[PDB]
Design an enzyme around this catalytic site. Structure first.
Site, mmCIF file in Angstrom:
data_model
loop_
_atom_site.group_PDB
_atom_site.id
_atom_site.type_symbol
_atom_site.label_atom_id
_atom_site.label_comp_id
_atom_site.label_asym_id
_atom_site.label_seq_id
_atom_site.Cartn_x
_atom_site.Cartn_y
_atom_site.Cartn_z
ATOM 1 N N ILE A 138 14.810 1.732 1.765
ATOM 2 C CA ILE A 138 14.709 0.431 1.127
ATOM 3 C C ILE A 138 14.192 0.637 -0.285
ATOM 4 C CG2 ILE A 138 13.822 -1.865 1.233
ATOM 5 C CD1 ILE A 138 15.747 -1.037 3.534
ATOM 6 N N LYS A 139 14.873 0.042 -1.256
ATOM 7 C CA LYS A 139 14.539 0.212 -2.658
ATOM 8 C C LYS A 139 13.671 -0.961 -3.114
ATOM 9 C CE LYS A 139 17.513 1.946 -5.640
ATOM 10 N NZ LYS A 139 18.438 2.090 -6.831
ATOM 11 N N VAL A 140 12.504 -0.635 -3.659
ATOM 12 C CA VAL A 140 11.471 -1.599 -4.012
ATOM 13 C C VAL A 140 11.027 -1.330 -5.449
ATOM 14 C CG1 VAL A 140 9.125 -2.318 -3.520
ATOM 15 C CG2 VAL A 140 10.688 -1.722 -1.619
#
Length: 352
Positions: A138-140
């Site tokens: 997941i890209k945050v």
């Protein structure tokens, strides 16, 4: 030639593709890439905006989803999650072959959550579960709230791509949050060996911001100098006794990932960023055109740690000129979030 990707692996760097589309996977192209040395995939809202607008295989999917009572966001997520899950399946053999160290696919949370730590955690947990693959990241975005969320997500066992880093200070804050999440899991007797985190440090946007006003001997050099100094900071942080105690128990180091490595100034060679940033235990995610330039006429050499002294001297001169790279980093992160939100709004409009 094509073997350059393998030569770069031998120098300790993975090359990922900074693009994703339904046809890339469905055509078999991604699978063939994952045989020829590509090691992973990153996406972001601009990537999806362009893919949804240009890839003919989405038309039937959009028509199907418009027959359902869904919000534009949920229509987007259904499409994007399906693409990511299909790419993860393509990359799974690679991922499993290295014990879970390679073969990741990244999906970014909604840009509107970037300052909301709790909302970011909720969406990242939900997307991780929706993709339902062990090789999804997941890209945050690396805002202060994103670093808050990173610690929680790591303590939940979720692999994360912390994106829109432009600052060495903020990167070190991310490493500290990661370590806190790892320590929490070890204290609870939970596994950590399959948690992977990358810190995606953006390259071209620094030079784009500064070059027009820099003196000649510094044009085209600041972003590479920052990255080289970040890598030195990385070596120091992760070899220190504090982290060594965690790695001894199975913790993985965060890895630096060079993003925005397409060259945007025609005055520089198209392989500049890839060629200049190769070092052990790193990743470089490259747009298609840059991957094919690197295959055609790139060079595989361990350049990232070369001439660190000159990187330091350049950064000292940048400071002497009055450029505060920490102020710049905050501005570039702000601007990148605005641009991603604009792309996201543009891709939602046809899904209404």
């Amino acid at each position: 030639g094509m073997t350059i990707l393998s030569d770069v692996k031998a120098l300790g760097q993975q090359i990922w593709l900074d693009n994703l589309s339904r046809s890339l996977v469905q055509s078999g192209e991604l699978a063939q890439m994952l045989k020829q040395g590509v090691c992973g995939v990153t996406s972001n809202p601009a990537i999806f905006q362009k893919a949804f607008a240009g890839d003919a295989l989405y038309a039937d999917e959009v028509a199907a989803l418009k027959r359902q009572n869904l919000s534009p966001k949920q229509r987007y997520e259904t499409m994007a999650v399906a693409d990511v899950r299909a790419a993860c399946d393509v990359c799974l053999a690679e991922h499993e072959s290295t014990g879970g160290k390679t073969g990741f696919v990244s999906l970014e949370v909604s840009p509107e959550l970037a300052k909301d730590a709790q909302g970011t955690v909720e969406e990242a947990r939900r997307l991780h579960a929706a993709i339902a693959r062990k090789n999804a990241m997941i890209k945050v975005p690396a805002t202060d709230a994103g670093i808050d969320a990173l610690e929680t997500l790591v303590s939940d066992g979720i692999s994360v791509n912390l994106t829109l880093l432009f600052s060495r200070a903020q990167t070190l804050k991310a490493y500290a949050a990661y370590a806190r999440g790892i320590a929490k899991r070890l204290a609870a007797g939970q596994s950590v060996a399959h948690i992977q985190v990358v810190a995606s440090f953006f390259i071209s946007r620094v030079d784009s911001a500064l070059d027009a006003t820099l003196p000649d001997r510094l044009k085209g050099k600041t972003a590479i100098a920052l990255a080289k100094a970040a890598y030195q900071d990385w070596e120091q942080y992760f070899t220190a006794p504090e982290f060594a105690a965690l790695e001894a128990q199975g913790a993985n180091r965060v890895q630096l990932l060079w993003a925005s490595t397409g060259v945007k100034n025609p005055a520089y060679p198209d392989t500049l960023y890839v060629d200049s940033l190769i070092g052990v235990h790193t990743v470089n995610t490259v747009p298609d055109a840059t991957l094919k330039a690197f295959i055609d006429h790139g060079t595989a050499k361990a350049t990232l740690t070369e001439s660190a002294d000159e990187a330091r001297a350049r950064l000292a001169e940048i400071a002497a000129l009055g450029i505060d790279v920490e102020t710049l980093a905050a501005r570039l992160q702000e601007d990148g979030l605005k641009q991603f939100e604009e792309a996201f709004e543009k891709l939602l409009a046809p899904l209404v």
